[PDB]
Design a protein around this ligand. Structure first.
Ligand SMILES: CC(C)(C)CC(=O)N1C[C@H](O)C[C@H]1C(=O)NCc1ccc(-c2cncs2)cc1
Lengths: 103, 141, 86
């Protein structure tokens, strides 16, 4: 079963999919292919929680009926610059304006 | 051109609304005029008597947004094999993002106020060009 | 194989090339990053979500769910979808 994701760090957002049975580490390989940083220099998060490499996306709560194509789940991403990992930071999207008087 | 064939051969059909919309079934009668029938709420179904060669299409009762039936525009009841009805499976199409946007805008703004929206003229025209059954009958023809 | 769509406010959205080629406008802007000076991120993220949605449910027997659009973003999204022809 496919799960649909936004892997997010700072102002970077990756839209991809993975299998419910796939591992956190395997997700990091996907990130490696895209952002050119190896898994050891990556941390993945669900909200505030640090994810473990060996756990499946299913165990970590990304299921096919919550991580949907039209409304995918967010996975936090943080990089290690050299010695220590940065703190998890996700820039929010811009805000929509006031609804026009007619709406 | 698009009319039901007056076959007089009964065909039982299950209208199954697997959409989130209130569905209006439309029978194209023998002179090509669209005849509306009672509506189906979301997720409901009805066993109905129709006829072989009859033409049906299905819309959103409120907005007339187009729907699919067994993956296509038109449903034509076929021969019943071994006392089993024909399944007519009514679903949402994959609307373009543009048309979907237009549906939501139409649903929030009264037609009298489209001109007050701050958008290029051509979108104002696209909003006023509502989904219409006669239009699609000409398109299908 | 991926492409980068950048919103007016700097957000960088990374999607599969074939998902982005949905849009004829983007196909043209590529023939591999694209900067959208009129599309804020709260709209472009929705555009990307639609790509995923279209690719998943185009020619599919599994029942199709409604693609959701908040009233707050509908106008802006309409403008973008019109420009992108998707
Ligand atoms: C020329 C007539 C309309 C008498 C021929 C006819 O009997 N028709 C035309 C179509 O084939 C359907 C059929 C008919 O009207 N059947 C009765 C019927 C009643 C209600 C309904 C529906 C009930 N709920 C949604 S549709 C469907 C069929």
């Amino acid at each position: 079963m496919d799960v649909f994701l936004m892997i997010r760090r700072h102002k970077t957002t990756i839209f991809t999919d993975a299998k419910e049975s796939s591992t956190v580490f395997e997700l990091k390989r996907i990130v490696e292919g895209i952002l050119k940083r190896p898994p050891d220099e990556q941390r993945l998060y669900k909200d505030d929680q640090l994810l473990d490499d060996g756990k499946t996306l299913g165990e970590c709560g990304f299921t096919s009926q919550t991580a949907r194509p039209q409304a995918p789940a967010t996975v936090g991403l943080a990089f290690r610059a050299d010695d220590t990992f940065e703190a998890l930071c996700i820039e929010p999207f811009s805000s929509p304006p006031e609804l026009p008087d007619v709406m | 051109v698009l009319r039901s064939v007056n076959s007089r051969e009964p065909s039982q059909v299950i209208f199954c609304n697997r959409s989130p919309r209130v569905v209006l079934p439309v029978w194209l009668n023998f002179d090509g005029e669209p005849q509306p029938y009672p509506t189906l709420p979301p997720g409901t179904g009805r066993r109905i008597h129709s006829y072989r060669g009859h033409l049906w299409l299905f819309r959103d009762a409120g907005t007339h947004d187009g729907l699919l039936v067994n993956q296509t525009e038109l449903f034509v009841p076929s021969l019943n094999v071994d006392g089993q009805p024909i399944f007519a499976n009514i679903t949402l199409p994959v609307y373009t993002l543009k048309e979907r946007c237009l549906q939501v805008v139409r649903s929030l703004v009264k037609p009298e106020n489209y001109r007050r929206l701050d958008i290029v003229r051509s979108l104002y025209e696209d909003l006023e060009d509502h989904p219409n059954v006669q239009k699609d009958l000409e398109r299908l023809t | 194989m991926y492409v980068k769509l950048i919103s007016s406010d700097g957000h960088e959205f990374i999607v599969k090339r074939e998902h982005a080629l949905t849009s004829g406008t983007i196909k043209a802007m590529l023939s591999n990053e694209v900067n959208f000076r009129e599309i804020p991120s709260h709209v472009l993220s929705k555009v990307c979500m639609y790509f995923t949605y279209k690719v998943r449910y185009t020619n599919s027997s599994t029942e199709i769910p409604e693609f959701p659009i908040a009233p707050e973003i509908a106008l802006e999204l309409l403008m973008a979808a019109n420009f992108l022809d998707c």
